[PDB]
Amino acid sequence: SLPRLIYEDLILPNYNNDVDIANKLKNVKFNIFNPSTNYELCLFLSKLTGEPSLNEFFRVSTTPLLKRVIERTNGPKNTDSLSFKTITQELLEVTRNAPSEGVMASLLNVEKHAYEREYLNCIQRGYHPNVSAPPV
Amino acid sequence: VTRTAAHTHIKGLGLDESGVAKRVEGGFVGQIEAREACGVIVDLIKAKKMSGRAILLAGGPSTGKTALALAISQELGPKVPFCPLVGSELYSVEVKKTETLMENFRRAIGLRIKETKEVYEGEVTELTPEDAKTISHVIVGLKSAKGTKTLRLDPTIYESIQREKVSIGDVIYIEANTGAVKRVGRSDAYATEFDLETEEYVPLPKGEVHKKKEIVQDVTLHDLDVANARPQGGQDVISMMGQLLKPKKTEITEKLRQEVNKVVAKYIDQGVAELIPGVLFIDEVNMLDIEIFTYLNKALESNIAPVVVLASNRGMTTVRGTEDVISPHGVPPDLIDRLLIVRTLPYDKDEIRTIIERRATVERLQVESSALDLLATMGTETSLRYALQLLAPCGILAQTSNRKEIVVNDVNEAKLLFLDAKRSTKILETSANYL
Amino acid sequence: TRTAAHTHIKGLGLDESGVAKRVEGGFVGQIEAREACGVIVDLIKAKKMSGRAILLAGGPSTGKTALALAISQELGPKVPFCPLVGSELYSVEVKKTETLMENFRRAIGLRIKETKEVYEGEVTELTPEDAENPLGGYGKTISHVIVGLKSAKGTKTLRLDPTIYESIQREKVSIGDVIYIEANTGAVKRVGRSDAYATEFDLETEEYVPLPKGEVHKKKEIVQDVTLHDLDVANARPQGGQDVISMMGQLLKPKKTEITEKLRQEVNKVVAKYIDQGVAELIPGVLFIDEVNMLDIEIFTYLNKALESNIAPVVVLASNRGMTTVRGTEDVISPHGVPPDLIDRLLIVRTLPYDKDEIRTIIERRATVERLQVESSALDLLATMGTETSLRYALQLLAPCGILAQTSNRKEIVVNDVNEAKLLFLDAKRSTKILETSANYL
Amino acid sequence: SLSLIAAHSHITGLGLDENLQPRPTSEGMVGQLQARRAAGVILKMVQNGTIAGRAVLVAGPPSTGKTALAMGVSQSLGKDVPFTAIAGSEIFSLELSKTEALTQAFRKSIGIKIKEETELIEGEVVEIQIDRSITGGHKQGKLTIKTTDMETIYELGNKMIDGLTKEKVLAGDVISIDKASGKITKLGRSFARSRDYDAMGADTRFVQCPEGELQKRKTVVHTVSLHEIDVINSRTQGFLALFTGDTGEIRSEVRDQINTKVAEWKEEGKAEIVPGVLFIDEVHMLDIECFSFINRALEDEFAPIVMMATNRGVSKTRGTNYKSPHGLPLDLLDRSIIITTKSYNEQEIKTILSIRAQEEEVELSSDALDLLTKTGVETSLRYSSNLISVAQQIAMKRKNNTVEVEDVKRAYLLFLDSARSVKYVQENESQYIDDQGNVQISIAK
Amino acid sequence: KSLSLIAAHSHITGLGLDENLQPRPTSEGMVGQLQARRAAGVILKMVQNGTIAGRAVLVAGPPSTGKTALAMGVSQSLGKDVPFTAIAGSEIFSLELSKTEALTQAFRKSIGIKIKEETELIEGEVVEIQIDRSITGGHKQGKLTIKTTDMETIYELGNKMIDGLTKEKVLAGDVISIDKASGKITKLGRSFARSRFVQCPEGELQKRKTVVHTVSLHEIDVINSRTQGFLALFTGDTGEIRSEVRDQINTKVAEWKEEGKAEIVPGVLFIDEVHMLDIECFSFINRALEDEFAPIVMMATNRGVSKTRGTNYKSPHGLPLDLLDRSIIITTKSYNEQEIKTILSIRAQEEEVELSSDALDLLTKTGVETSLRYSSNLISVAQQIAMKRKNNTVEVEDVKRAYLLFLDSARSVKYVQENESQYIDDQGNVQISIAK
Ligand SMILES: Nc1ncnc2c1ncn2[C@@H]1O[C@H](COP(=O)(O)OP(=O)(O)O)[C@@H](O)[C@H]1O
Ligand SMILES: Nc1ncnc2c1ncn2[C@@H]1O[C@H](COP(=O)(O)OP(=O)(O)O)[C@@H](O)[C@H]1O
Ligand SMILES: Nc1ncnc2c1ncn2[C@@H]1O[C@H](COP(=O)(O)OP(=O)(O)O)[C@@H](O)[C@H]1O
């Protein structure tokens, strides 16, 4: 049970509190990734990462993690950059669509070989939880 | 009604225009030299020019160090920041102690911002959007008890209006500078469309639709540091449920601090921001480790470090984290060479009696003079704090027998019920099995 | 050109079928330790044994790290070499046992070879040919896709599956771009746009890779060199997946985890299966640990366990202590800070101090590497200085001498410059004498 | 601005000649001729850049000028050269090892320099016309951008159309487009349309309309340290780890591929290498493991010049149970060269006090300066330095502008030094809590 | 509510005092300890007045002499709606929170905000529900005949009330409460109609009720910190709440207090076995006791001149002298024969045990010989030995059998010192073999 006073005077904005003003002052006006005031840092980070949009850092720094995970798109990056291809990412990339009996795919398919060898897709379930409850 | 807790009879330092202390003024009795030194320190802080100055005030227990620190904070006013701290708070289980010390250092530098609040609030009487699949702008009509007013709005605020499920007849709240949209509920003119509905019904606003207000925002530098150093990302305006993965504190790099300083230095020159340095007060400084004592030397040499005020009540004491470093006040000699030491002297009988009378006045109790002499004798015999904490049981025991006034027998009864440390030690020594 | 305390040594300097000569490869003296290190290098090149341990011991400024780096240069760049400090095993993310096992698996390499059949070049036409009898309730049923490719000195029209057109649409392959199709998988990828289609628009973001050389179709044999730790961290972490856990962990901090023995066993058995097929070669290497007195007895015990493994590489340890207590124990007196259980499992190579002529020759080589010109009398006085204080102090006092010679607009170091460098910069003994003879917290 | 009067802000560079000969008083430094000459030699070693992995040690008594010399070296180093100044207690972390913290501190001190060219088209959008074909595979764009002086019509590609549909501009926003790289940004909205929408909203900002030439050319220079590349190539979105410090024990393989690729970039000619200085103040409280890692990590080509400062005598080393000179083991002291500072006399203390009084904008008389010089002869120097600042306020409370001897005497009586505090503690030892927790609270026996 | 089998202090219902704060010889389950009970009554009047804050009271004495009993009596005589946080000394050494942060949370859990508010409800008995639905579910029509024992009415229902009545299916014969503003409908049950079971409500259908909420300061601190939700009040991962939001809550609480929208209630923080705290905890308490938003802290300990934890010296009660300067001390005393007999009689009546008189004298003799808690523990074992031989009253030999079966401390020490060759000593030497 929560009273209406805390919710009214602490969460939602009204005429006597400054929630929205402080939120805009903290998240927009004094943000260090703002291109209207920190264009040099944005250009430096664009050279570092190779991102073609200078407003991307503002978008990344002002979004929740799960939402950033959900609408992640594999956009292209320019070649003239300092972020290059680390070797394990290349090993991850060559086995994306590789078929069986290829040497890199077979060296990269340990877990599915263990799944298909140990007959794990016909095994039973031995544990169930005792209580299942919704959030409070 | 009013709550008193070991203080709040202290209103300030009680100095005149020339900086000379009065004897009994501002709730302070005696202690001329330490009050004059604290007034000089207050003037230096009000000068707003020097960074990294430090002050250590030392003396016996129950002498007035924390009272002098609170008097400094009251003399500065509520506009100047003041961060009180204990030496045991620097040990955390999420980040290193140097990060906590740097965060508490940057918590004491503030900024004053001039801002405006613009508010439209009323009944929605017309909600017409127009395009050119993508809307161009929406005309919103608002009505209050003093009249109507029409507005044009961008599609961004229209998306938040539609997200809030605003229809014709709802009382809304639109902030012009931030774009925040709040829905209050349906109006009482539409309360009879059904006999039973789930909507809450609010009356029309009595005042005008358009309101303007001048406001002043105070923000510390640690607020601007923590507003940009979120590891998970930004959060929404309204969230009663937290994020699924727990965000812990992290060691904030100096590059973010430099960029925050660059932004603040750009904003100061335009006249939007005003910079105010403040005070970092650390009581019980003898609880600090030698590593924090070393990092304090580097932190006091920065360009933006505030005025630090320390206190200690020890003698020649071994520094924690070391084995054979005997030093005064538990402070290593490297940091003492950067310090200025203010001594605190103990009190005599008449000052103890005056302090007891002053505390009895602010607690709204009436004491007989013969009881006051007994309380002063008890304060000199055992402790000033023991005499101060025995006033409320005396008041309760006087109120028990329907009296508004303290008698000597109440003092004797309260002395019989409650003991000090010395009599407890005497019972402890001449005992058989664990008291 | 950057010189930093080394890189004047180019291998050990032995001749074939014989012993070390007196001065060769940047080495002066130390004949017997060089011969022993050459025997160890030949044993490593024999590529048969596993888990052999060498501890080389001696005083400070003797050349243990120089001998280890000479071993690394003598093996070459294709054999793995993992340098390490005993203080690096203490991590606050995973236990030190897992860090030691990771550094063990980092020192073994796998050389793989493969053949790729590719079709690449600029697209000339892209026509999905319809079928003769399309099915009802559908639209544009495709029988095959005709793609024409053009490169340097060669054009060729192809005949494809109906399936790849979906990948062409998903990869946004228009006309005029340069594509890349491998044979067995399909999987067209868009490598860029041709440079002949660069200046029709004033503003664009897409890069312009030029036309590729050679024919459109060529089988290329590639050779890739990996380590076993790379295979372990590639199989342990998941691939590109559609689950929320995989995308959430990819945007979070890559926290190290305790790799199980089951994954290592599966990796070793699939590596052995492909080695027996004749495709993969196994190259064991060297794991070098400097200042092994910093290890405590738990890591020593796990070293005792792990040196008896089937796959473990050659471990080279360096230490300079004498009769010292082992860390983590209060009363065990041991040589070089190494417990007798590990001491019994290794071979010890002893290194000897130098004399005045060898100090002078080492100073001469370090001067001729740093592009400096030294007078002969100044060289003799520097050799006397190195005899009196330290070899490293004489070596480190060369660049202030060159700077002070340059400041006087001369190109040669003289006696006055080395006297000025003597007076300006102190050594350990004179600083200790200053500390002892002063009482102002000096 | 955002800089107050610090402890030593009067030091602007090292006061040397062209023949590395120190002036008696210039650029804020007074005295210490041999230490300043040695620091000039080390400065020339850094500016040469052909050497790597050298360790100096500034040893001296407290209040002598070791960190003053380090500040002078940092000020005379110039811009765009990395100078990483840390203390001894910074490397003890809860989620980073001491070895990894030292590795990050080492790789923060060596950078690379990259030059690039920019062709900027910055202006206010007037009208965007999108032309779509019948097939729809290719699209064209008519862009009408403007300045206060000239305007023109630009042709767009389909990637322009996709990149402007995202972060969508609304015909009156200020953008800036690159030609060589195609960088797209939305700076905000013009002030000409500020009275249009009656409420701005959350995600908008107002900028001035750009003037002058619409086309601009500018060459910019970037200095990126190796730690930034290490952090960036370790995650997917790594700049948040750059600004929050949650990098968390970056592996060694990415470090060696970055070393190999930066060697390849130096060989190609794209970038060049700028070495710098790593300063460690109060080096005496590091563990023996950190010293082991330091004297092994000083032997790499990608290692900066390490300046360590300490003031301990013959004291114990942390992590062990024996004493050593300067709190450092002899293995580390073998690979070092020591600059030794010397204590001051009356004249140098007087000159330093005069400089510090000039820097703080405090006017003194001759007698007050002589009294402060005598106090700094008897007590330390920092006590007189603080006495100047408090005597200025005591002077200003009297409606007097210059500091007199009465004000210095009052500030001397009000604030105590170390020795008088020790004497007052030792005379009144019963009123303080000793090492056994005993204290006489009551004033009566 | 509040299920409980039998506790060690379950017979204590409060401090037995008159209107002049004088202790009765036997009242509310507490006997003896007149001066300590009077002092705790004065402390209770301090708490009930609420005009002073941050006063520390130390309860010290021998073990098993009415300390936790006194704290339980104070907590029972405080009543409900007043915060009481009873923690132990070893509960603050956490792995995700620092000691000062855990102490700050325990301090701020003991100050409450009292807020009164009014809401309107429709509590009634459903006579008839009529639902008219379309084919596609576009427009719904609804009639609701609902009543009390006093009135009867029919309501036209809108679409959202139709959706809220279809969800959580309400049938005829049910008793429900409807909130008009939030749309929360709760089934109280079924009415008295044989044709669970509750009574049909009386009076008006549309009632307006005032509810009183007591919210701790720690709850508002958790809510106002935006990094975590209110579930950290239940899951427990608050995780080092910053001081800025504490400053905002401390300003806003005084702002509400000045405007009269809320009230301040102070509570009691009880720290049982306070000697197990560290020195850094005492140094934090020395400054945390001087806040305006500070409760009354009662600490209980039984140590005498022991080593302070975190240091190497010895201090009275295990506490340093600067903390002991800030406290007043209530001292307990050992019990006599008559008070031990009365306590054992009260515990006999509590556990529904019927005792003979001579068994009570034997229990009193072995209680003044060995311990109070030993005779308080034998009294329920002897009842089971009595019930084994099928009789209700516990006799003398029933107490003797339990005395023979179950040992005490002194006899165990005697037998261990007699046969120490069969046990493991400090050096780890044992003898398992019987011969030789
Ligand atoms: N000069 C004074 N006038 C009035 N009250 C005083 C004076 N000095 C101390 N007190 C009171 O005595 C108590 C001493 O507390 P405090 O100063 O915190 O102890 P310590 O000096 O050990 O920190 C305070 O409650 C304060 O109100
Ligand atoms: N035989 C040698 N020939 C040439 N230089 C040597 C020789 N031995 C040692 N050095 C030089 O001495 C310096 C320090 O020796 P180092 O290998 O560090 O000894 P240690 O590892 O035992 O401390 C190195 O820079 C190396 O160049
Ligand atoms: N040669 C110098 N010229 C000017 N000021 C100096 C000089 N040497 C020391 N100081 C001053 O002395 C003060 C303290 O000396 P510091 O550099 O901290 O010595 P240390 O680092 O040995 O403690 C500094 O504020 C610095 O400005």
Ligand SMILES: Nc1ncnc2c1ncn2[C@@H]1O[C@H](COP(=O)(O)OP(=O)(O)O)[C@@H](O)[C@H]1O
């Ligand atoms: N005055 C009393 N009235 C009733 N029971 C008491 C009284 N004093 C002690 N007891 C009983 O004695 C036992 C010990 O009391 P307690 O205070 O919990 O032990 P300790 O003093 O070690 O904390 C408790 O179970 C309690 O029921």
